[PDB]
Design an enzyme around this catalytic site. Structure first.
Site, short mmCIF file in Angstrom:
data_model
loop_
_atom_site.label_atom_id
_atom_site.label_comp_id
_atom_site.label_asym_id
_atom_site.label_seq_id
_atom_site.Cartn_x
_atom_site.Cartn_y
_atom_site.Cartn_z
N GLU A 174 0.84 -1.23 0.00
CA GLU A 174 0.00 0.00 0.00
C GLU A 174 0.87 1.27 0.00
O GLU A 174 0.78 2.12 0.89
CB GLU A 174 -0.98 -0.07 1.16
CG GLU A 174 -1.90 -1.29 1.08
CD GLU A 174 -3.26 -1.14 1.75
OE1 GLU A 174 -3.36 -0.29 2.63
OE2 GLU A 174 -4.21 -1.88 1.38
N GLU A 215 -4.27 -9.02 -1.00
CA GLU A 215 -4.84 -8.72 0.33
C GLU A 215 -6.34 -8.45 0.20
O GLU A 215 -6.72 -7.63 -0.62
CB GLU A 215 -4.13 -7.53 0.97
CG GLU A 215 -4.52 -7.32 2.42
CD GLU A 215 -3.86 -6.11 3.08
OE1 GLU A 215 -2.67 -5.87 2.88
OE2 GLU A 215 -4.66 -5.36 3.97
N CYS A 259 -9.87 -8.04 3.02
CA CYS A 259 -10.34 -7.92 4.43
C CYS A 259 -11.83 -7.54 4.45
O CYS A 259 -12.32 -6.93 3.46
CB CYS A 259 -9.50 -6.91 5.21
SG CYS A 259 -9.74 -5.20 4.68
C1 LIG Z 1 -4.50 -3.95 4.13
C2 LIG Z 1 -3.25 -3.52 4.94
O1 LIG Z 1 -2.00 -3.73 4.23
C3 LIG Z 1 -3.25 -4.21 6.30
O2 LIG Z 1 -2.16 -3.69 7.06
C4 LIG Z 1 -4.56 -3.91 7.06
O3 LIG Z 1 -4.57 -4.54 8.33
C5 LIG Z 1 -5.78 -4.34 6.25
C6 LIG Z 1 -7.15 -4.14 6.95
N1 LIG Z 1 -7.30 -2.88 7.68
N2 LIG Z 1 -6.75 -1.63 7.35
N3 LIG Z 1 -6.33 -0.55 7.16
C7 LIG Z 1 -5.77 -3.61 4.91
O4 LIG Z 1 -5.85 -2.23 5.20
#
Ligand SMILES: *[C@@H]1[C@H](O)[C@@H](O)[C@H](O)[C@@H](CN[N+]#N)[C@H]1O
Ligand SMILES: *[C@@H]1O[C@H](CO)[C@@H](O[C@@H]2O[C@H](CO)[C@@H](O)[C@H](O)[C@H]2NC(C)=O)[C@H](O)[C@H]1NC(C)=O
Ligand SMILES: *[C@@H]1O[C@H](CO)[C@@H](O)[C@H](O)[C@H]1NC(C)=O
Length: 497
Positions: free
Chosen positions: A235, A340, A342
Site C-alpha cells: 500500500e 490482500e 479484508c
Molecule cells: C491492508 C493492509 O496492508 C493491512 O495492514 C490492514 O490490516 C488491512 C485491513 N485494515 N486496514 N487498514 C488492509 O488495510
C-alpha cells in the site's frame, strides 16, 4: 471424513468448532467417474462443503436457466489461493496446544483441508504486530551490518511456514511485502505517518532499501525458505497520507517506477535471488490503471515487473472493468494478483462476527469478480485472529476465516473459511478460466475453469434467498441438472473424457 461441529454465536450461520482432538476434515480427494459429476455444497442453514454425486444427462429440455461451458474461450491461468502469516496469526496459532495447532494448519494446507498454496509474509512489523520493529533499527546502518530476523520470524512465522509446507501436497508459493523501512531511511523518521525514502532513486537511501530486500531473502534462505515473489511495497499510497496510523512507506507511481528501474530491479537481478518475481502496486484497484501506465510504459521499470498486486476492501464497492479490465487490455502480459482482502473495515461493523454468512458471501463474490477480470490469484489477510480480531498495536481489528479462543484451546472455522475453500480446494495452480454463458438474466455468480488434466470445475454462488433451478451444458459430456439453493455456494467437478 469428520463433520462440522456447529456452534451459533447468534448471527446468520454457524462456525465449525475445532480443538486439540477434533476438527472437521475431508476424505482424500477422489475423481467422479466419467458421465458423473461431484457437487460440494455449503449453505447458511449449516451444510459445510458436503459431497454428493449425480449423473451427466445426454439430453435436456426446459425454459430454465442454462449455463453453457465454452471450453475454447481460454482466459488467465491460476497461480493459487492462500493467506497471510502475520505476527498476529502466528502468535494466535502457537498459543494453541500442539495437536490443535496441527489441526488448524491441516484445515488450510492439507488435502484433508482446503489446499492453500500461497503464504504472504510481512517483511518485519505491520498493524497485525504487537510491537514496531524493522530488520535494521540501528540508525544510519547503510551497510546493514545490524540486519537481523527477530523472534517474530525465527520462533513464530518461519517454524509455522515450515509446518504448513510439510502438510501441503501442492507446492506452496511464498509472497513477501514490506510495510515500512527503517525510520532512518525515511523523510519523517517514523514507522507510520506521511513519509517516503529520503533523497532520490539511485542514491544511498534507495540502494540500502533495495539491499534490505536481498538481506531479507538471504536470511529466509538460511532457514531453507525461498520466495516465489516480493511486492515493491505494501500500500505505497498509505505513506502519502498525513497521520497514517501504522507502518507505511509513501511512493507516488513515479517514485515506485524510478525505485524499481534504478534500485530494486537491478539489485534483485544481480543477486542469487534473481528468479524471485517482483509485483508492483500491492494497493487498492481504484489506483488502476494510472499506476500501471506510469510504471509499465517505462521499459527500464517494466523489464523487472512480473505482475500487479491488488487489494480488496470487501465492505466497500468498486468497478472491476474500468480497473482490472482496462489494466489487462493495456498490459495483457503482466499478470493481475489479489494480494490482500479484508472484511469488517467500516466504523459501525463488529470486527469479528462469528458465523457471519454475509462475510462468507463477500469473499466468494469477490473471488468470482476477480476471476472474471483476469486475476490469477487471491490472498486473504491474517490466517487467524483472536475473537477481538487481534492482536493489532493500533486496534485496527478485522475478521479472519479462523478465530482462535486460547482460553478454550479452541478455534472456529467461519463461513469465510468454506467460501474460500470452494475455490482453493478445487482450483489447482495452472487451472485456466474458460467461458461460461447464461441463457437468461439471473441472480447467480458463477465461473468455470479447466484443471491442467482437462477436467472441469464450476463455482456457483447464490446470494439471493430464492432456490434457482439450473442446468450446466458441457458440449463434450452433456447436461448437469441441479438446483442452487438460496444462500448457498456449490463447486461442481467432472471429467471431460
Ligand atoms: C491492508 C493492509 O496492508 C493491512 O495492514 C490492514 O490490516 C488491512 C485491513 N485494515 N486496514 N487498514 C488492509 O488495510
Ligand atoms: C473437542 O471437541 C469434540 C467434538 O465436539 C468433543 O468430543 C465430544 O465430547 C462430548 C462430551 O464428552 C461427547 O458427547 C461427544 O460424543 C464427543 N464427540 C465426538 C465427535 O467425539 C471433545 O470433548 C472436545 N474436547 C475438549 C477438551 O473439549
Ligand atoms: C551490531 O552487530 C555486531 C555483531 O553482531 C555487534 O557486536 C554490535 O554491537 C551490533 N550493534 C548494535 C548497535 O546492535
Amino acid at each position: 471424513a469428520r463433520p462440522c461441529i456447529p456452534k451459533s454465536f447468534g448471527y446468520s450461520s454457524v462456525v465449525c468448532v475445532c480443538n486439540a482432538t477434533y476438527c472437521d476434515s475431508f476424505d482424500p480427494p477422489t475423481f467422479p467417474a466419467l458421465g458423473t459429476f461431484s457437487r460440494y455444497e455449503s449453505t447458511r442453514s449449516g451444510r459445510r462443503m458436503e459431497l454428493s454425486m449425480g449423473p451427466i444427462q445426454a439430453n435436456h429440455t426446459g425454459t430454465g436457466l442454462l449455463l453453457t461451458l465454452q471450453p475454447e474461450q481460454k482466459f488467465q491461468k491460476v497461480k493459487g489461493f492462500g493467506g497471510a502469516m502475520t505476527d498476529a496469526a502466528a502468535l494466535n496459532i502457537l498459543a494453541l496446544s500442539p495437536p490443535a495447532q496441527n489441526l488448524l494448519l491441516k484445515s488450510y494446507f492439507s488435502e484433508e483441508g482446503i489446499g492453500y498454496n500461497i503464504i504472504r509474509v510481512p517483511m518485519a512489523s505491520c498493524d497485525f504486530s504487537i510491537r514496531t520493529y524493522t530488520y535494521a533499527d540501528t540508525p544510519d546502518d547503510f551497510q546493514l551490518h545490524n540486519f537481523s530476523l527477530p523472534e517474530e520470524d525465527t520462533k513464530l512465522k518461519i517454524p509455522l511456514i515450515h509446518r504448513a509446507l510439510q502438510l501441503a501436497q501442492r507446492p506452496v508459493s511464498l509472497l513477501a511485502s514490506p510495510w515500512t523501512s527503517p525510520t532512518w531511511l525515511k523523510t519523517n523518521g517514523a514507522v507510520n505517518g506521511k513519509g517516503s525514502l529520503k533523497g532520490q532513486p539511485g542514491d544511498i537511501y534507495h540502494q540500502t532499501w533495495a539491499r534490505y530486500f536481498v538481506k531479507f531473502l538471504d536470511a529466509y534462505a538460511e532457514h531453507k525458505l525461498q520466495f516465489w515473489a516480493v511486492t515493491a511495497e505494501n500500500e505505497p499510497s498509505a505513506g502519502l497520507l498525513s497521520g497514517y496510523p501504522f507502518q507505511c512507506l509513501g511512493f507516488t507511481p513515479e517514485h515506485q517506477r524510478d525505485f524499481i528501474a534504478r534500485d530494486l530491479g537491478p539489485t534483485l537481478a544481480n543477486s542469487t535471488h534473481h528468479n524471485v518475481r517482483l509485483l508492483m502496486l500491492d494497493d487498492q484497484r481504484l489506483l488502476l490503471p494510472h499506476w500501471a501506465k506510469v510504471v509499465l510504459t517505462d521499459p527500464e521499470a517494466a523489464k523487472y515487473v512480473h505482475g500487479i498486486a491488488v487489494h480488496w476492501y470487501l465492505d466497500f464497492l468498486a468497478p472491476a472493468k474500468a480497473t482490472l479490465g482496462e489494466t489487462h487490455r493495456l498490459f495483457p502480459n503482466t499478470m493481475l494478483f489479489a494480494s490482500e482482502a479484508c472484511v469488517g473495515s467500516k466504523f459501525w461493523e463488529q470486527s469479528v462476527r462469528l458465523g457471519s454468512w454475509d462475510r462468507g458471501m463477500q469473499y466468494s463474490h469477490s473471488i468470482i469478480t476477480n476471476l472474471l477480470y483476469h486475476v490469477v490469484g487471491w490472498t486473504d489477510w491474517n490466517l487467524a485472529l483472536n475473537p477481538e480480531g487481534g492482536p493489532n498495536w493500533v486496534r485496527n481489528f478485522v475478521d479472519s476465516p479462523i478465530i482462535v479462543d486460547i482460553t478454550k484451546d479452541t478455534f472456529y472455522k467461519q463461513p469465510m473459511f468454506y467460501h474460500l475453500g470452494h475455490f482453493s480446494k478445487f482450483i489447482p495452480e495452472g487451472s485456466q478460466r474458460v467461458g461460461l454463458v447464461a441463457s437468461q438474466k439471473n441472480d447467480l455468480d458463477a465461473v468455470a475453469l479447466m484443471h491442467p488434466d482437462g477436467s472441469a470445475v464450476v463455482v456457483v454462488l447464490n446470494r439471493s434467498s430464492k432456490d434457482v433451478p439450473l442446468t450446466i451444458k458441457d458440449p463434450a459430456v452433456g447436461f448437469l441438472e441441479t438446483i442452487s439453493p438460496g444462500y448457498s455456494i456449490h463447486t461442481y467437478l467432472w471429467h471431460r473424457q
